[PDB]
Paper text:
Transcription activator-like (TAL) effectors specifically bind to double stranded (ds) DNA through a central domain of tandem repeats. Each TAL effector (TALE) repeat comprises 33–35 amino acids and recognizes one specific DNA base through a highly variable residue at a fixed position in the repeat. The crystal structures of TAL effector (TALE) proteins bound to their respective target DNAs have revealed that the residue at position 13 is the only one directly involved in DNA base recognition, whereas the 12th residue stabilizes the proper loop conformation. dHax3, an engineered TALE protein, proved to be a useful scaffold for structural characterizations. We then present fifteen crystal structures of engineered dHax3 variants in complex with target DNA molecules, which elucidate the structural basis for the recognition of bases adenine (A) and guanine (G) by reported or uncharacterized TALE codes.
The structural observation suggests that Ile34 may not be a major contributor to the affinity of DNA binding by TALE repeats, consistent with the classification of NI as a “weak” TALE code. It also insinuates that base A may “tolerate” a wide range of amino acids at position 34 of a TALE repeat when there is no steric clash. To test this speculation, we generated dHax3 variants with the 34th residue on repeat 7 substituted with different amino acids. In total, we obtained nine high-quality structures that elucidate the accommodation of base A by Leu, Met, Cys, Pro, Trp, His, Thr, Asn, and Glu at the 34th position. Among these, the hydrophobic residues Leu, Met, Cys, and Pro all adopt conformations that do not clash with base A. As what happens to Ile34, there is no specific coordination found between these hydrophobic residues and base A. Trp, Thr, and His, in spite of the presence of polar groups, do not form H-bond with base A. They also appear to adopt conformations that simply avoid steric clash. These residues may all represent weak code, if they are used for base recognition.
Author numbering: 231 to 723
The structure:
Amino acid sequence: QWSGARALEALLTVAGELRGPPLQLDTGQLLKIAKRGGVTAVEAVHAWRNALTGAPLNLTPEQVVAIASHDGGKQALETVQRLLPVLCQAHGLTPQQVVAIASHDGGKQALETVQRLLPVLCQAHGLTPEQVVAIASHDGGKQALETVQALLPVLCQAHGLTPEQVVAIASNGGGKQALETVQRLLPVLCQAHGLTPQQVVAIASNGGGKQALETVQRLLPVLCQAHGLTPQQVVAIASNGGGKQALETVQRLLPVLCQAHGLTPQQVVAIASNCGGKQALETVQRLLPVLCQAHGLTPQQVVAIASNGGGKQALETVQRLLPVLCQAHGLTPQQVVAIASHDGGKQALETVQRLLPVLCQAHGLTPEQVVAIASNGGGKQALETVQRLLPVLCQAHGLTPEQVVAIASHDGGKQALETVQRLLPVLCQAHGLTPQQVVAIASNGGGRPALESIVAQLSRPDPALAALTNDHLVALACLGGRPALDAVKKLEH
DNA sequence: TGTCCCTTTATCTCTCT
DNA sequence: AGAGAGATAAAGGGACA
């Protein structure tokens, strides 16, 4: 018989019992733990169910799932109940920071290394606890922390990097590898190829940073004699997760795409310059004729769709959904292109296909409004949040649909909508902002932190902002969000 | 296998003027 | 506002005990 059967049965028995108190996990949460943490993680969650949820630790089930759903999840669960109080009491970290550190493969190793190295990293090396947490919060966080401890001096002194740059390089999966490669390759890239340290740090500061750096060293000459690419274009392609893959694929496909479809090298670089650029490029070579055929999409529209992260997904989804969205949902092909041309275009297109009839019929929105909400990065999230929160925002908080749509229609729309729902009453009732002022602040990218910064200044007034009236703070918050507020704070000192 | 570490892709959010 | 920059999660494979 199949040898996985006993383990599967074990998995399903324990999984069954976890649906009950005190965690009450659903099918999704149970699969996710089983998929990454495996059977031992599911058993560990069960064995630890009472110790984790209530006093002292008081972790939400969602936090428990976050910790359990990684390789070594059983180890991370044991370590969190042991070290969370130690790290909160003795180093001043928050439970949320400890959970963040724990929620990666080898989370045990990261937690124990933070307990061990935070004092020396902050005292002897000048890092903040926030920076130590960022470094720790990735797979291999232990390796990254130990490599920062070892290399921070030689990187700053012998190689001229700031501590901030070292931290930025370290704060990715494989960070140890990127730091070691930057040490070796910084003078080579800078002195042989005229790259600035800032450009090298940018290439290094992604997952797989080591691979992108070595690939830049290898291919920069070939790409900048043969293909007429500039160093700046090469840097841009490499300054992204999977940079190595994008760069190699640009070498392969630049002449194919230019010659066979009349794309410019500019257009090719733009397609390549996202996570998954490799995937996007290969999909363009495949699908452009299919999309542009029989007077379909234009080349220019295909380039726009492809020129975002997940371009491959967006392209394939357009091919699938253009007819059904145009025929059945009444959208123009131009509106499908708009929705598709943002990171996560696939998700937004599918969510529009699913929610356009509902938002229109149940909530009284126009298709144009649904399209505008969808046509930003994270469009799926904004659309679902509008569906969820339109009745409460309108009926309980007195906003018009138009105001809700405005808040929703920027990157981070979901966050802005949730924060408005959260903070509208204290901003208006407790501190005298008008709803229109709250809507204005929230109706920009970064609407959520801009609102939180405002609430913070009204709730725990910093003297440095006291010379500003509420109306002035509102104007600043609309002008430049949290950063403007923070900038003003510093200017005062 | 279970655990740790590294890489790639996809998605989401905020910043920068 | 659209280009730039940065966070996070899923998922696969090397490595090794």
